[PDB]
Amino acid sequence: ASTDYWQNWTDGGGIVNAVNGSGGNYSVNWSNTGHFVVGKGWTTGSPFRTINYNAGVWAPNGNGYLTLYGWTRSPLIEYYVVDSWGTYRPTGTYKGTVKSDGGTYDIYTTTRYNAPSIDGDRTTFTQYWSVRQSKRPTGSNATITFTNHVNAWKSHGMNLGSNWAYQVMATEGYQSSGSSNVTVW
């Protein structure tokens, strides 16, 4: 499917060189950064959506995530489906496990306090995570069956909002350097 949304945010730390490529393709080259998030997807996420991607380059030097990333409003939730990462595996309060698309994921919740929302203003809000148990191999075509993760989250008391905001396959980094090239359809 065609993607329609370009996600490109940086807090202004070091160098984050993001290229909005052809169709669903993007690249990021970063170095000495703060925190940033870059990817391609859809402005309006769906709990039914099935995401295909091929990360031609996954080369973080330090702490970066290769991840489905998105938000709902009413209420405000930030969510992840983490397929690969750098030096650091993200975690939070363990809720259980889900099998999807050839992988086993851990389910976690977090709370963020005094923290920038989708809109940038500081408040308190919950995050939902599925994080793969070991890293997914990269460079061939990969599916994330989001509804598997929506369903398993619901069985663990993790309900998503009613008003969907954007939903992208992203590179997120934390005080690191690296290169990535992801294609999303």
Curated annotation (Swiss-Prot):
Its EC number is 3.2.1.8. GO terms for biological process: xylan catabolic process. The active site is at 78 (nucleophile), 172 (proton donor). It comes from the Bacteria. Pathway: Glycan degradation; xylan degradation. The keyword NAD does not apply. InterPro entries: ConA-like_dom_sf (IPR013320), GH11/12 (IPR013319), GH11_AS_1 (IPR018208), GH11_AS_2 (IPR033119), GH11_dom (IPR033123), Glyco_hydro_11 (IPR001137). GO terms for molecular function: endo-1,4-beta-xylanase activity. PROSITE patterns: GH11_1, GH11_2, GH11_3. Disulfide bonds: none annotated. Residues 1-185 form the GH11 domain. Belongs to the glycosyl hydrolase 11 (cellulase G) family. This is Endo-1,4-beta-xylanase.
